[PDB]
Every structure is written in C-alpha cells, then in structure tokens.
Design an enzyme around this catalytic site. Structure first.
Site: not given
Ligand SMILES: *C(N)[C@@H]1CCCN1C(=O)[C@@H](N)Cc1ccc(I)cc1
Ligand SMILES: *[C@@H]1O[C@H](CO)[C@@H](O[C@@H]2O[C@H](CO)[C@@H](O[C@@H]3O[C@H](CO)[C@@H](O)[C@H](O)[C@@H]3O)[C@H](O)[C@H]2NC(C)=O)[C@H](O)[C@H]1NC(C)=O
Ligand SMILES: *[C@@H]1O[C@H](CO)[C@@H](O[C@@H]2O[C@H](CO)[C@@H](O)[C@H](O)[C@H]2NC(C)=O)[C@H](O)[C@H]1NC(C)=O
Ligand SMILES: *[C@@H]1O[C@H](CO)[C@@H](O[C@@H]2O[C@H](CO)[C@@H](O)[C@H](O)[C@H]2NC(C)=O)[C@H](O)[C@H]1NC(C)=O
Ligand SMILES: *[C@@H]1O[C@H](CO)[C@@H](O[C@@H]2O[C@H](CO)[C@@H](O)[C@H](O)[C@H]2NC(C)=O)[C@H](O)[C@H]1NC(C)=O
Ligand SMILES: *[C@@H]1O[C@H](CO)[C@@H](O[C@@H]2O[C@H](CO)[C@@H](O)[C@H](O)[C@H]2NC(C)=O)[C@H](O)[C@H]1NC(C)=O
Ligand SMILES: *C(N)[C@@H]1CCCN1C(=O)[C@@H](N)Cc1ccc(I)cc1
Ligand SMILES: *[C@@H]1O[C@H](CO)[C@@H](O)[C@H](O)[C@H]1NC(C)=O
Ligand SMILES: *[C@@H]1O[C@H](CO)[C@@H](O)[C@H](O)[C@H]1NC(C)=O
Ligand SMILES: *[C@@H]1O[C@H](CO)[C@@H](O)[C@H](O)[C@H]1NC(C)=O
Ligand SMILES: *[C@@H]1O[C@H](CO)[C@@H](O)[C@H](O)[C@H]1NC(C)=O
Ligand SMILES: *[C@@H]1O[C@H](CO)[C@@H](O)[C@H](O)[C@H]1NC(C)=O
Ligand SMILES: *[C@@H]1O[C@H](CO)[C@@H](O)[C@H](O)[C@H]1NC(C)=O
Ligand SMILES: *[C@@H]1O[C@H](CO)[C@@H](O)[C@H](O)[C@H]1NC(C)=O
Lengths: 728, 728
Positions: A509, A592-593, A670, A702
């Site tokens: 991740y 995702s990341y 998504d 997503h």
């Molecule tokens: C996938 N992990 C995507 C791309 C990087 C950020 N992503 C998210 O889905 C984020 N919104 C996850 C997240 C949610 C809430 C907080 I506060 C921090 C990160």
C-alpha cells in the site's frame, strides 16, 4: 490429512469471523441487536432484558435496519431502504416507533431519501438533511421546520459534506452537530459552484438503452476548491411562524486570508464550541474556541482562545490534525501532537494559554485519545513491546503522569496485541475489541475494578472450524535500511518448509502515514495464496509509513513515488537474500495507492520483480483530488512543486514495463481514483509498445465491492499470479 | 530457406502493395500525382505534362493533405489542417490557388473548420459547409454568399449529414449536389432535435486534467430518428440584398405518411432531379423524378414519374436501394433490383412507365452499373465461373441485350478475377483495377478497340520481394449446408502438409450481405498467422451473406444472430472433421458484426471452439443505431420483433462462456459501436461467474487505428492466440 484455505473459502466467507457491536445508552447500559431483537444489557448488575422484540421489524422493501434509540429512550429510529453513494454517504428511509404507546408513527413521517438523520444528544429531538437542506423535528409526530433553503444538487450542501469533504476531511457524510443539551445545532454549508466536474459513463442495467453520465464536483490538484461556511442555530426559537435564529462563525484571520478547510467540530459546553481550521496548504492548523454571548446570541472568538499547530517538515497530523478532547468544565483540553522529537504524544493545553505540557513521551506514538474523566485519560498507543504495528489501551492519571497503566497488554499477550476500545458515558465501563494476532476477542470491563465483567464474543466457533484446516502463519520481524529498522511481515505457507524455495508476493500500500505491517488477524486472499498455493506474501512499511514518528512519515513530503517505492525494492531485494525465496518468481500487487506503488516499482526496471498487478491505481497525481494530493505534494505549478508532479507519474516509466508481466485493473465507476488514471496509463504503455493485460469492471466503484465483481477480480488475479508463477 | 511473412512485416507494412490513383477530367485526360507533382496525362497518346510542380507545395507553409482542381482548370483547391471526425466526416482548411497567375488567392479565403467543400460541375463556383451552414462562392476572390441560417451544433445540419446519415445512408458527410450546369444547388437539411445523445469519455493527452464528455445525437434502435428536408436552390438570384430562392421537395405521400429516409439524389438534366426515399421500415422504397417548372420555380412531381420498389422477403437493396442511372436525355434509366427469382439484375425503366425490363439475368448478380453511353452500358458482376467472390467488367448493348461482352474475364484469368473500374468522362476510356488473387494490377483501356493501352502499375517490385519469402496460399472452395453450396476460403501455411494436424482459426464477419470469401489479394494478419505460426485461417459465408441472391441473404431478416452464427458452427464442425485440422485447437475471431458473431458462437456451447477474440462487438441490438438495426430487425416493440431482439443478445448466452477462453477488446472512444456494448457484455459474464480476458483502448475508436494501437492489438491478439493453441 486436513484441508487448506481455498479461494472459494475466501470468496464465499465460509470461515466467518464474528464481532460484537453494541450501543452505549448511559454510563452503564448498552443496546445489542441479536438476530433481530434489541436487548438492553446492564453492565453494573450483569442482567439483561429484551428492549423490543423481533416482531416489530416489518420489512418494508427487502431486508432492513440499523437502529438509533433517542437518548430519553422514548422513541427508536429504524433505518432501511439503504441506497449507497460514496464511501460513507448514502440515502435511506426511516420509521420512528413510539416506545411508549408502542406504535409506529405514521403522521409527519421522515422523507424518502433522507441523507442524514440524528437524535439530539438529549430528549428526543431530530435533525435531518433531505435534498441538501436541514429540517428539525421537536417531536416525532410534529411537522419539521425547514432550516435552510439554499439546498441544491451538485452545488449547495447544508448539513452534509460534498464529495471531497466526505472523503478527505470528515471521513463522513454528516455535517451537523447538536450541542450537549440540544440547545444549539451547528452545521456546515459547502458551496461547489466553482468546482470543476469529473464525468464518467454509468451503463446501469442491461436494459438501459443509453448510458447515463455521472457528474460530480471533484477538485483535482490545483483546481478550484469548494468553499464553506459554518453556522450555529438556536433551536429554542424554532416555530412554524418564526425565523431561524442563527449565527455564522467565521474562521480566524490567519486562515480567512486564503483557501482553507473546516476539519473539526467539538462541542465543549452548551455555551462553548471548538472549531478546527486548516489553510489549504495543510501545514498550518488552528483551533478557535468560541463562547456564547447570552445577551446577544452571538458566538464570540478570542486570540487568547486560539491555538496554532503547524508543521515545518511536512503536514499537520497524520491524515488530519488530531482532535482536541476537552475537560468537563471546558477550561482545558488534551490533544495529540508531535513533540520536539517528532513523535505523536498527548499534550495538555489550557483553553486560554498557548503553551502546552506533554503528558507522555517515548519512541512510540499515541494513536488517539479515547476517554477523559476528571482523574484519568485513556488512550491507545503502540508502545507495548516496541511494536509500531500493535495497539493497546492505557490509562494515565491526570494528577501524576507517572501513574500510567496498560489495561490490555497482558489480558491475552499471545492472542491479543491489537485493540480498539469503546467506553460508556462518563467512561465507567468499556468494551475491549481485540483484532489479533489471534482470533478476534470482544470483552466488557469495569473502569473502577479493571475486571473483565464478561466475554461478549470469543469466536470459539471459528476456532473449531480452523483447527481442521492448514492455516498459514504470520510473522513480523525487522530489517535495516538507511541505518533504520523497518518492520515487515510474511504470511508463511503451512508446514513452512525451511530452506526450500517459495515464490514471493509483495502486497503493498505504502501511502503516506500508512501501516501495512501489523498484528491484526485477517482471513484474506493472501491466506489462500499461502495455504493453498504455497506462496509467501510479504509486506513492508518503509519511509512514509506512519506510527513511527515524523522522521519516517515526512520522508516523502513533496515527493511521493520516490522513497516508499524505492524501499519496497530494497527490502524485497533483501527478502530474496534469504534462502527460502525463489528469486526467479517474485511478484508485487496493491490497490489504489498500492496500485500506484505497484506500478512505480514495476516501472523502476530493478530486475527484481517478474510480474505485478495494480488495481484502481493512481497514475498521475494531477488527476487526484486536491485535499489529499496537495497535502503531500503542494501545488502542481512551476512556482511550487510542478517538477516532482511531472516526474512521478507512472507513464514516465512506461519503457521499462517491457521487462515485466503487468495486469492493470480498474472499476469504470470509480468516483475516487477515476477510471481516467488507468486510461492515461494504458495509453502511455500502448504508445510505448509495451504488452500488458487489462481488466475493466463495468459499474464497479473504488471497491469493486459487488459480490460478483469481488469474486471475479480475485479469481482473475489468482489465475494471473499462478500463470506468472507456473502454478497449477 | 526463405524468411516468413512476420507479424512485424504486417504491422510495419515492410511489403508495400502499390496502386495507381487518377482523376478523370475529360474523356481523354486524367490527373495523376507523381513524386508530389500533379501531372496531366492524355489517354491513348500516353504522354503527360506537368500540371503543377511539387515546388508549388514546398512554398506553402503547411502539409497539403489533399487537392482538387476546378473543372475549368483555372484554380486548384489545397486541403490542409485535416482533422478527422467520424468515418467520412472531418473538417479542414483550404487555400485556393489561381493556376493562371500562379498565385495563392489571399483574400475572401475559405474559413478554417470547413466541414465540406466542392466545385460546381463546370466553371469554378464553390459551395461549402461551415458551422452547419451553406456558403456559395462564385469567384474565388469574391465574398461568399450565405444560404442557410439554421445551422446549430448537434441539432441542425445544412448540406452535411448527421451521424446516422453519414454512417448508414450516404456513406458520406456531404449533403450538397450541384446541378449539371451549376444552376441549382440541391441540399438536405438534418434535424437531430429529438434524437437522444450517446455520451462517452474522451481522455485526450495526459495533460488534460479532466476528461472531456463527447456527445453525439445518435439514434439507437426504435428511438426518435432525425428528420430530413430536401432543397433545390436557384443560385442565379444569389445576391447580398436578395432572399434565397429555394423549393422544398417533399417525398411522395406513400412515404411522407411516416418516418422516412432520403437515400439518394441524382441530377438527370438541369431541369430534372431524381430523389430516392425509403420508409423507416426499409422494405418500401420509391423514386420520385421531379421536373423544373420555369413559370414558378417549383419542382413538380407526377405519379407517372414515380417508381415504387419493395421487398416481401427482406429489405430493399443490399445496404440501401440501388441508385438509378439515367440516359443523357433523361427519359429512361437503368437500375439494379431483384428478379422475380430473387437475383439482383439490371432492369430498364422508362422515366414515366411503371414497368421495366430486365436486361440481365441468371444465378449471379450485378454488383453495379459503372458507365452508360448511348449505345452501351458497363456493369460489374460475379457471373464469371459462377464465382460469387469474383468481379469482372461487362459491356451490354442497349439495342440488343443478347450481346454482352466481358472486358476483364480473359486479361489474366489466373492473376485477375476481381476487378473494379473507372471511366473517363464520356466513357471513351476506362481504368481497370485488378485486386486479386494475384498482385494488384492497374491498366488503361480504350472503349473503342478495348485494347490495353498500357500498364499503369503492375507491382513488379512487390513481386520480387515476396518470392524471397514463404508466402501462404489461399484456396477457395465449397461445402454443402442445408443442401446449398456455400463458399469458404483457407489461408494455408507454407509447404502445407495434409496428414499433419494444424490449428484452425476462423475469421468471421457474417454481417448481412457481407462477403469474407473473395479473390482479393491481401497482406493481412492471417497471412502472418499462416506463413509464420503455421495456423490455418478460414472464412465462411453462410446464410445472410450477399451477392448470391435474396434467398441466401434475406434468410436472417428479422432474426439476426441466428442462422449466420449457426452456419459458422456447422461449417467449422466440418473443417474440424477434416484430416489436416486438429479439432482440439479451433478458434474464431471477428470485428464489429464479426465480433458479435464470434461471441454468439463461443457462447453457443457447441463445444467446437476452444477460444475466441471479439473486437468492438455488438452485444445487444437495441444498442446499435436505428437505420441499420431496424433494417434487419425492424422495431424492438412487443407488437413488432421485440422477441428476436431479446434472445439475440450475447449476454443471454453468458453462462456457456465457462467452456471457452475469451478475449474482449473495445475502443473506449468508439462512436459507432459504443463501448457500452462491451461494458454490458463483461458485466453479464462477471455476473455469471465466468472468467474471460479483456483489453480496452483509451480513446481509440471503432477502427482502433492509431499506428501504436493498431500494432498493440495485433501483437496482443497474437499472444492470446498462441497461448490457446499451445504455440511457442
Ligand atoms: C487509494 N488508496 C486512493 C489514492 C490515494 C488516496 N486514496 C484514497 O482512497 C484515500 N481517500 C484514502 C483515505 C481516506 C481518508 C483519509 I482521512 C485518508 C486517506
Ligand atoms: C519533384 O519532382 C521531380 C520530378 O521532376 C522529382 O525528381 C525525381 O527525383 C527522383 C529521386 O531523386 C528520381 O528518381 C530516380 O529515377 C531513376 C530512373 O530514371 C532511378 O534509376 C533512380 O533510382 C531514382 O529513383 C527521378 O528521376 C526524378 N524525376 C523523374 C525523372 O521522375 C523530385 O524528387 C520531386 N521533389 C520532391 C522532393 O518532391
Ligand atoms: C524525480 O526526480 C528527482 C530529482 O532527480 C529524483 O531524486 C533523485 O533521485 C536519485 C535516484 O533515486 C537520488 O540518488 C537523488 O539523491 C535524488 N535527488 C534529489 C534532489 O532528491 C527522484 O527520485 C525522481 N522521482 C521519481 C518519481 O522518479
Ligand atoms: C427541428 O425539429 C423541431 C422538432 O423536433 C422543430 O421544433 C418545433 O418548432 C416549431 C416551430 O418553430 C414549434 O411550433 C414546435 O413546438 C417545435 N417542436 C418541438 C417539440 O421542439 C424545429 O423547428 C426544427 N428546426 C428546423 C429549423 O427545422
Ligand atoms: C414492411 O415492413 C414492416 C415493418 O416490419 C412490416 O410490418 C410488420 O410486420 C411484422 C411481421 O412481419 C409485424 O409483427 C409488425 O407488427 C408489422 N408492423 C407494421 C407497422 O405493419 C410489413 O408487413 C412489411 N411490408 C410488407 C407486407 O412487405
Ligand atoms: C431465438 O429464439 C427462437 C425461438 O426459439 C429461435 O428460433 C428457433 O431456433 C431453433 C434452434 O436453431 C430452431 O430449431 C428453430 O427452427 C428456430 N426457428 C424458430 C422460428 O423457432 C432462435 O434460434 C433464437 N435465436 C437466438 C439468437 O438464440
Ligand atoms: C460493425 N461492422 C457494425 C455493426 C454492424 C454495422 N456496423 C457498422 O460499422 C456499419 N455502419 C458499417 C456499414 C456502413 C455503411 C453501410 I451502407 C453498411 C454497413
Ligand atoms: C437489572 O436488574 C435490576 C434489579 O437488581 C433492575 O433494577 C434493572 O431494571 C435491570 N436492568 C435490566 C437491563 O434489565
Ligand atoms: C427473530 O428472533 C428469533 C429469536 O428470538 C429467531 O428465532 C428468528 O429467526 C428471528 N427472525 C428474524 C430473522 O427476524
Ligand atoms: C456559492 O458561491 C458562489 C460563488 O462561487 C456565490 O455566487 C453564491 O452566492 C454562493 N452560494 C451560497 C448560498 O453561498
Ligand atoms: C402560523 O401561521 C399560519 C398561517 O400563516 C396559521 O394557520 C397558524 O395558526 C400560525 N401559527 C400559530 C399557532 O400561531
Ligand atoms: C506551508 O506550505 C506552503 C505550500 O507548500 C509553503 O509555501 C509554506 O512555506 C509552508 N509553511 C511552512 C513550512 O511553515
Ligand atoms: C503530349 O503532351 C506534350 C505536352 O506535355 C505535347 O507537347 C505532345 O505533343 C503530346 N503528344 C502528342 C503528340 O499528342
Ligand atoms: C445592397 O446592394 C447595394 C447596391 O446598390 C449596396 O449599395 C448595399 O450596400 C447592399 N446592401 C447590403 C450590404 O446588403
């Protein structure tokens, strides 16, 4: 003899993991829905008793419920007809049932498609958002009072967040807060008028002849962000022929100056509220504590009561600044912050003094504050055994920071190393939730005697079920990179051979402040990859990860795609040094990341990985939303950080994909990481003459969360990994 | 010994097949571009003169993509800044060059973003469409005169077709027609007001932060179609201070009754125009020859001059009704229609007598009328060797239909069995084009002695290269299905060895009136597949194919996705039981209608095919456009054919996909066969728990023709094929 965890086991959740969800409703009683009946458990006498039977949940659609009982216990709110939207947001229908006359309220019912509803803290008042406007019901059988008239689809939200606030700021749909005794109801208004729109096709059911186009106000890096306003309604004057009495609290000058965000709301007392704002840059936060002027009805602010928190090495907080936890008199509070050493610890502040006093210190971090009484403060940290991937509940005496005790460390040291807690009111009792490394365990405790009043759920049923299968084992160890020790974990196959060689799969991740390595029990796709396919599945938290101090977390500030990616390689490299790893068969994957880093690593041309799989990966940070991206990369302009934006896209590394087998997957619906990201990625590869494989999922978001999709992707990813691994 | 035709040879066209493109401009002169010079040749004499030196191009500050000389030889139009839209449509920039003073007219220029332009048949007038409006320029150096004012984007088109008329009825973007002497300027106006919009995403270059939403007024089956108006404008009264003189020619009442299409416009004389209309249900068609009335300006029609054409077994024509070929005087015309025996032949009509006389007959068909003189009529048919997949030029004597001479049959009986021709202005000379089975050969002939004046291009160069490479052989033959003789072809690998077992790939289109089996020479992907990978590639024309009579073609009328796919299976099943075919390795692939047919077969659970590739397949007819879909399926309502619509989708066969390996490719910017079609198909498969492989192409359209994409999809499909066939 016995079996192995199979893909079908994982995909059909044949091995269920039970949990125990309760709902405190006093300092010593709680509600729990079993099968379908809400039971009232008394934690002080140990006795319980049905609160209202199964025979009242008349399915008015398909399935039903989630419930909410008014603080005065005179009414109960029933939710059903749930329509999901984004991650936290959704519409649903509600029915109020009178617990006195014991009848369902039929007059003045709550609208179909309510976006958010809630009882006042006390009594039985209601406040809901329907069509972006706020309504209040002083009685369940009375007519609600419309509070806002500005509500407007895709433009004005009153009481609920817009897409970016739901996702990156509040981590919720809700944007309204009642004051302790229900005198005031505060809310936020969001304006998306100038926020560009992301658009994509949603094909719907096979029978829809023309695809529809979903349009959402989504600010990508640099784009025009939504603005916001905050109000405090004095519900005491609400009457059908009276005007809504309100007051708008504006942010402090240091923030009004430019683009900012509302990131936290805390009611201190009926006459005192605490707002937490952050400039758009996100390295300057501030807490403004407002007091109610009785003679004028306005919430006055004060420099004496404002508290600045900034970050010179990165951003403020982990994912957002820590919330403050006020004392009962509201004259002082505690909030987590970084100390002189870069570690997240509890600091004590006095409402009107700017200097605080840390009440904890160490080469570990306080995860979050849990409860506060007049004598103690209960928190969670990863101090125990010095494992950053562990969580335990602790209590510290407010009059002697020397008297700190771990309330969960030794309850089951081998089975339980990762807890989350849930206190009752006044915190006289608490539920302990243990998530691993052993099967999950929920137990109730008394705060005074610190005794285990009882076991709510032990998963003993799953225990049996598992002793008959060949489960893999999860080990957490350490390696050194840059003179620093970073943690990693490996899911090892059953009867883990020894010096024999196994194919390796890195599951990554690595997003900022993330933690993939932990002691949480999980029954996942990896479990199956190890148990049935005999694949080692490792994970590693290098630079950028969290819970280990800012030195490590801010290593990637303004340069995502560098260290966290590089450390994934350096570590896998060492993993291959070890004799049980078959260096000719090492793969990587992430969502995702994790999809981004999976791709960046595969694009590094390090020669270490044979194949990979990215799912809904970010590909170019300028396509992602403002709040999250700007927090770590600043603005994508030449005067700011446009350079590092430019050299961290996945496309920039396309020529090297020729050296690996790649599987790219994305859900066409998504709303988070727009399909766009993968569209621009595959195009670069195509332009580059790189062969790879693809998989689009029609209408999945997503999560690729529908049952059929869920099973499809993992089945599809499984065949791929097995092919790349030459596995039958 | 010699190399083989490799995948790379096919992708980079290492072996060029030369051709010869000329433009007639009299009865004995044609223009020809040579080494970027425009030469003016003289038939018979064979000599040629420089009409325009390539030095003229280089002085221009841009890439001249195309040119057009005024019929009076005084000016030349230079097309540049080409920007393709749909299959035929596109906009451009134009410069007019004065051939006499050899200058580049620089005032009162043609606007940029011209949708279509064209010279009057004589002199040097110009008519062009810009912003959906018509402009007429009498002199190149004088202001143009606006003709329409209704032109509005995505709703009103003047002088240019809308999406569906371009693709389905006119196979062109122009809807303008100068009269023989340029007096009148006929044009159709298209109203898309009530036509639904197909919306899809176009991502564009990486730098584009937000995707762009493309919207086209596209009528899908049974949907509101665009309406049409025809107009004849008298250009003689064209003056800035004068209104426009135009008369609207409405179709005969039998057609005006309901939804209809204008599918033909033919000028006969300066005072006589022939319009051809068709009813939304394309089984009724009528020709209405209108005359100019000097005393009113009206274009009058008379029942005598109306010729009704209808089908009781299917639809009129092959894709649209054949067009009328009038005589110089305009009192008679020749047109191809169906025999009483269902075979398409040339019937002689009287401009005002409802009866006609077939001047040709037999169990073969006339493909089309090429030229018509006062003594002879030239046409193309596939009568020779009763070979439906052949093409030859014939001449028939108008005064005695007994004397017909085949002008191409015996020129090279072994190398040339498929021709197409081009006649000089009065048919005093004609160019013959030989496309197969041998190397294409272009030649010049004199209508007088019919002797071959000279070889324009023989591809001798190509012939030299290929002898040094193991080219595969193409054999055409027949088999019997349902007691009929249906043709097929197999591209056999070099040094074929019956007795040895080859894998088989069926390439299929099968669309109604299609023809995969012909004698055209083609350097294709199959060539590589058979020359290099030693895979046999076969094509089969079963029920529904064309050029064999209505009994064969109309068999699938109102039941698409049945007999033709069923016929592909039966046929393969025969090939399968042959000796040189390894039935354990049979695949089938196709594009568009072919993609649909490939899918329906794979999902037939006939157990014949191991794997299949479908590119931009139709999956559900209700998703395709009305003009084409309604022509073979009628209307998707319960009172019409809704039932064959319902059980002809691919989704309805999703389950049977569990038995085969499937590849699904589709351009995300396919305006023709919308991505939606595959999006819907994968969703069905995912919901049926079926595993398959996918491949999307960001922004590529129906042709997936960018050079980079073009390569990727064939490399990709090649890998997939080799895997499935267990080929290294
Ligand atoms: C996938 N992990 C995507 C791309 C990087 C950020 N992503 C998210 O889905 C984020 N919104 C996850 C997240 C949610 C809430 C907080 I506060 C921090 C990160
Ligand atoms: C503009 O047009 C002139 C023609 O007037 C082009 O000149 C042509 O140039 C080519 C290449 O240099 C010559 O080809 C040569 O032909 C001989 C056969 O005689 C062959 O043996 C050589 O291998 C070579 O291919 C050609 O002869 C010459 N003109 C003729 C006689 O056709 C000129 O190239 C054009 N300029 C541009 C850049 O468009
Ligand atoms: C983007 O470019 C920067 C600047 O060159 C890269 O940073 C350098 O990376 C190399 C190789 O890892 C290091 O040896 C240098 O010390 C780095 N220099 C600086 C100024 O940081 C960075 O790695 C690139 N990022 C991406 C996404 O490839
Ligand atoms: C294109 O067709 C539309 C109808 O689809 C025409 O719109 C009508 O216009 C008339 C007169 O202007 C009105 O009385 C009708 O109410 C309109 N119909 C609807 C439902 O819009 C339009 O005029 C046509 N455009 C042209 C220039 O021919
Ligand atoms: C011309 O085509 C029409 C349109 O399909 C034919 O009429 C339909 O015929 C089918 C059965 O063949 C019926 O189910 C539909 O209800 C009919 N619709 C209409 C509007 O009639 C029509 O019969 C054809 N004309 C002929 C007789 O050749
Ligand atoms: C759609 O359903 C019809 C009705 O069952 C099918 O038509 C019959 O199909 C069987 C199988 O080929 C034949 O034996 C009959 O002769 C067919 N004709 C009729 C009118 O019943 C048709 O095949 C189905 N089409 C598709 C695409 O599945
Ligand atoms: C694929 N071949 C697709 C589905 C069947 C119709 N399709 C087309 O692309 C056609 N529009 C091609 C075409 C164009 C013009 C005529 I007249 C006939 C067919
Ligand atoms: C539990 O029992 C006590 C009697 O000792 C009673 O007061 C109380 O109402 C009971 N509470 C519940 C939850 O049944
Ligand atoms: C209701 O609860 C009873 C237990 O008292 C249980 O037996 C029954 O199945 C439940 N019905 C449902 C599913 O609502
Ligand atoms: C929303 O913001 C726009 C400016 O972008 C402003 O014109 C409008 O008045 C605002 N709406 C409300 C209700 O604040
Ligand atoms: C509020 O106003 C309405 C009409 O405007 C009236 O019917 C109602 O009685 C008023 N409310 C009270 C209770 O005064
Ligand atoms: C906060 O971030 C902004 C934007 O990147 C930067 O320009 C500013 O100097 C930072 N302030 C600090 C580090 O105190
Ligand atoms: C061929 O054309 C040239 C001009 O390029 C001309 O001089 C010559 O006379 C023509 N040939 C004949 C004899 O017709
Ligand atoms: C109409 O033509 C006259 C010629 O007498 C000219 O003077 C006048 O400007 C024209 N009006 C326009 C521009 O339409």
């Amino acid at each position: 003899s016995r079996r192995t965890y199979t893909l079908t086991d994982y995909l059909k959740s044949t091995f269920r993991v039970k949990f125990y969800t309760l709902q405190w409703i006093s300092d010593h009683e709680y509600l729990y829905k079993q099968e379908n009946n809400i039971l009232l458990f008394n934690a002080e006498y140990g006795n319980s008793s049905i609160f209202l039977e199964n025979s009242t949940f008349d399915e008015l659609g398909y399935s039903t419920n989630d419930y909410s009982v008014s603080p005065d216990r005179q009414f109960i709110l029933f939710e059903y007809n749930y329509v999901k939207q984004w991650r936290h947001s959704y519409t649903a229908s509600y029915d109020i049932y009178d617990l006195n006359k014991r009848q369902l309220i039929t007059e003045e019912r709550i609208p179909n498609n309510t976006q958010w509803i809630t009882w006042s803290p006390v009594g039985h008042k209601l406040a809901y958002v329907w069509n972006n406007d706020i309504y209040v019901k002083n009685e369940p059988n009375l007519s609600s009072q419309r509070i806002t008239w500005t509500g407007k689809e895709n433009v004005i939200y009153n009481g609920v967040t817009d897409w970016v606030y739901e996702e990156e700021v509040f981590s919720a749909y809700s944007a309204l807060w009642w004051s302790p005794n229900g005198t005031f109801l505060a809310y936020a208004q969001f304006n998306d008028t100038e926020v560009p729109l992301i658009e994509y096709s949603f094909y719907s059911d096979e029978s829809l002849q023309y695809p529809k186009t979903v349009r959402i106000p989504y600010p990508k890096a640099g784009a025009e962000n939504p603005t916001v306003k905050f109000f405090v309604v004095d519900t005491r004057t609400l009457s059908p022929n009276a005007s809504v009495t309100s007051y708008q609290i504006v942010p402090p000058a240091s923030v009004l100056i430019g683009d900012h965000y509302l990131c936290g709301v805390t009611w201190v007392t009926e006459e005192r509220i605490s707002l937490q704002w952050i400039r758009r840059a996100q390295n300057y936060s501030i807490i403004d504590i407002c007091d109610y002027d009785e003679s004028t009805g306005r919430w006055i602010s004060s420099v004496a009561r404002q508290h600045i928190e900034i970050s010179t090495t990165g951003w403020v907080g982990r994912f957002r600044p820590a919330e403050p936890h006020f004392t009962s008199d509201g004259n002082s509070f505690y909030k987590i912050i970084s100390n002189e050493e870069g570690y997240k610890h509890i600091c004590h502040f006095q409402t009107d003094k700017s200097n605080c006093t840390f009440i904890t210190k160490g080469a570990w971090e306080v995860i979050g504050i849990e409860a506060l009484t007049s004598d103690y403060l209960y928190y969670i940290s990863n101090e125990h055994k010095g494992m950053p991937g562990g969580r335990n509940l602790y209590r510290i005496q407010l009059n002697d920071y020397t008297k700190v005790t771990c309330l969960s460390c030794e309850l089951n040291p081998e089975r339980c190393q990762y807890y989350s807690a849930s206190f009752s009111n006044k915190a006289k009792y608490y539920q302990l939730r243990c998530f691993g490394p052993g099967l999950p365990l929920y137990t109730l405790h008394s705060s005074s005697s610190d005794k285990e009043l009882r076991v709510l759920e032990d998963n003993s049923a799953l225990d049996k079920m598992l002793q008959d299968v060949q489960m893999p084992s999860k080990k957490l160890d350490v390696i050194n990179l840059h003179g620093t020790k970073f943690w990693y974990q490996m899911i090892l196959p059953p009867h883990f051979d020894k010096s024999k060689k196994y194919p390796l799969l890195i599951e990554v991740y690595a997003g900022p402040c993330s933690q993939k390595v932990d002691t949480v029990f999980r029954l996942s796709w990896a479990t199956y990859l190890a148990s049935t396919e005999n694949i080692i599945v490792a994970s590693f938290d290098g630079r950028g990860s969290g819970y280990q101090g800012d030195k490590i977390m801010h290593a990637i500030n303004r340069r995502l795609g560098t260290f966290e990616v590089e450390d994934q390689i350096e570590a896998t490299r060492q993993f291959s040094k070890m004799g049980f790893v078959d260096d000719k068969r090492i793969a990587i994957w992430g969502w995702s990341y994790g999809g981004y880093v999976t791709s960046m690593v595969l694009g590094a041309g390090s020669g270490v990985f044979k194949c990979g799989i990215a799912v809904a990966p970010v590909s170019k940070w300028e396509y992602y939303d403002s709040v999250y991206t700007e927090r770590y990369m600043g603005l994508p302009t030449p005067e700011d950080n446009l350079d590092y934006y430019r050299n961290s896209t996945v496309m920039s590394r396309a020529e090297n994909f020729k050296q690996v087998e790649y599987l790219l997957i994305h859900g066409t619906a998504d709303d988070n990481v727009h399909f766009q990201q993968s569209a621009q990625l595959s195009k670069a590869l195509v332009d580059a003459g790189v062969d790879f494989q693809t998989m689009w999922y029609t209408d999945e978001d997503h999560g690729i969360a529908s049952n059929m999709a869920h099973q499809h992707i993992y089945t599809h990813m499984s065949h791929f990994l097995k092919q790349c691994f030459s596995l039958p």
